[PDB]
């Protein structure tokens, strides 16, 4: 299924983006967080664990978390 293969790439790609945002966040705390940042992080983790098979359902949370980290910088 071509469509499923495309979805899998997006799923891996989104996961790597979550790792980059989280790693970027650890540096900030290290060399430094507003609840705005905190709230997005908890939202993202629980969503990703719940949507174990279809993680793209968390695209809104992922961007919100990444947006919170970007504003933090």
CB of 43 within 8 A of CB of 65? yes
Phi and psi (nearest 5°) for 34?
Answer: -55, 145
Residues 6 or more apart whose Cβ sits within 8 Å of residue 41: 22, 25, 65, 68
CA distance 22 to 6: 25
Resolution for the entry shown, Å: 2.2
Write down the experimental method used for this entry: X-ray
- Whole-angstrom Cα distance, residue 13 to residue 53? 15
Nearest to 67 by CA among 44, 45, 40, 33: 40
Domains contained in the chain, number: 1
């Amino acid at each position: 299924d071509w469509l499923a293969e495309v979805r899998k790439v997006l799923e891996v790609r989104q996961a790597l983006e979550v790792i980059q945002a989280e790693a970027r966040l650890q540096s900030l705390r290290l060399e430094g967080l507003p609840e705005s940042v905190e709230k997005a992080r908890s939202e993202v983790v629980r969503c990703l664990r719940e949507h174990d098979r279809r993680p793209l359902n968390c695209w809104q949370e992922v961007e919100a978390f990444k947006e919170e980290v970007r504003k933090l910088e």
